[PDB]
Amino acid sequence: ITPGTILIILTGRHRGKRVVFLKQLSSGLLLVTGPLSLNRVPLRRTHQKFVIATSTKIDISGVKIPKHLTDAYFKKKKLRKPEKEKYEITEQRKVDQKAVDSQILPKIKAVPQLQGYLRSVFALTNGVYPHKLVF
């Protein structure tokens, strides 16, 4: 798992979606992006034990990720119920999504067919066994 590596998410609502690794946060959780425009996965945290690292990489060496994207930034904010309470995408989050995506996305489109790869979803099919195939 090196920065720019394409990871397959195995759990959560985004399971099976191929995402881009950005960096490891101070708590050991990984920072990934969809990018949101390709598979609808935002700047999100994920656990390394719950992803499959592929051999497909992009060079995000020249990407500047904001320094305020820390574990505390992504930590859930408790919602009180006495009916319900709905999570609302803060405006700062949307601004950060475009800041990071606007740099990573052109690098994705350099690699032919890569964007289509990130739109697709991973699945096991007839006769396909994980221990046999390279990622």
Binding site: T54, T56, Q113, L133
Partner: peptide, 13 residues
């Protein structure tokens, strides 16, 4: 046998 997951996707297309 050594095809990568991305390679597998390109072949399918």
């Amino acid at each position: 046998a050594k095809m990568t997951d991305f390679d597998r996707y390109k072949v399918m297309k």
